């Protein structure tokens, strides 16, 4: 089952039997992250660490003690040693919690992984603010949404992509304070 | 044939179904944040296969309203 | 790269792309090579024709 131990290091000693030395051993993305998953720790009591991802911005890379998370199977919350989780997003809203003040992105869709040490991993695509999002097309939207029924299974795809996340962004929209 | 979600029975792939929900969301900002949006969402490159080491056909890409939601 | 003025990026990884198809290939793998950018494709056809697709 565990046949080929491969690794950073590992992968320095067998190109240092087949290339030339005059290259040095390329480097890896796992030697430029600090924080990984299995080492214990990093949860102190209260506050989790929480990485808000975007491809073309970071959000948040602050500590929290609760994070929720609009899953597939529905909004769940993650305390601080929560069960470790690899967790599907649908259109939702992330609501990021440190205490009386709630910092909540509405996102387009993306996984969420709690790690075992309690580190809490939220990589969407898009982040809306819900203080920014169009609150006059998210009705319009979903009219010929709802009525372009086609015969292709492509778009039968992209159309049940398309209502579910405008009718998200309703329900995220109306009831805000 | 497949088996999966409803994208992945379709024949779209992850990256195309949650670049589409992307996509869509990008439309209903607001326009100061909308414009802002619309920059990271033209593609444009070209691919090229290459068979024998010479030559082939190419596929250019143009689209400034995020991903093809085409059958491709 | 696209454009060609760098001055040893575009062939610094061609001598690291050739070091590396050389270290996982010791039993008969298969290997498609693709390359983004024009310094790519005409600094790889050069090491590696058959697996550039």
């Known amino acids: 089952e565990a046949a080929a131990p491969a690794g950073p290091k590992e992968f320095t000693e067998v190109w240092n039997k087949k290339a030339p030395s005059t290259l040095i051993v390329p480097e890896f993305p796992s030697n430029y992250t600090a924080v990984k998953a299995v080492g214990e720790g990093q949860v102190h009591g209260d506050a989790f660490p929480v990485n808000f991802y975007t491809p073309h911005s970071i959000l948040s890379q602050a500590q929290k003690d609760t ?23 649908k259109p939702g809203v992330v609501e990021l919690h440190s205490g009386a003040e709630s910092e909540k992105f509405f996102v387009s869709g993306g996984f969420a992984f709690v790690h075992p040490n309690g580190v809490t991993d939220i990589c969407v695509l898009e982040a809306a603010t819900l203080d920014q999002v169009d609150p006059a097309a998210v009705k319009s939207a979903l009219a010929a949404a709802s009525a372009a029924q086609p015969t292709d299974e492509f778009e039968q795809a992209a159309n049940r992509a398309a209502i579910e996340l405008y009718s998200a962004l309703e329900s995220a929209v109306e009831a805000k304070a | ?18 670049n589409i929900c992307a996509d869509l ?46 059958a491709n | 790269s696209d454009k060609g003025l760098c001055g040893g990026l575009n062939s610094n990884i061609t001598k690291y792309t050739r070091a590396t198809l050389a270290t996982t290939e ?11 950018g024009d310094k790519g494709r005409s600094q790889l056809t050069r090491i590696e024709s058959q697996r550039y697709q």
């Open chain 3, 26 to 36: 010791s039993e008969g793998k298969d290997v498609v090579v693709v390359s983004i």
């Open chain 1, 67 to 89: 994070v929720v998370l609009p899953g597939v199977d529905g909004y769940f919350g993650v305390k601080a040693s929560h069960v470790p989780t690899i967790a599907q997003l």
């Open chain 2, 1 to 18: 044939a497949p088996s999966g979600p409803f994208y992945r029975v379709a024949g779209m792939s992850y990256l195309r179904y949650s």
């Open chain 2, 25 to 70: 969301l990008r439309n209903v900002l607001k326009e100061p944040f909308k414009a802002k949006a619309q920059a990271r969402q033209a593609i444009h490159f070209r691919q090229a296969p290459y068979v024998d080491g010479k030559a082939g056909a190419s596929k250019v890409y143009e689209l400034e309203n995020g991903i093809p939601k085409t």
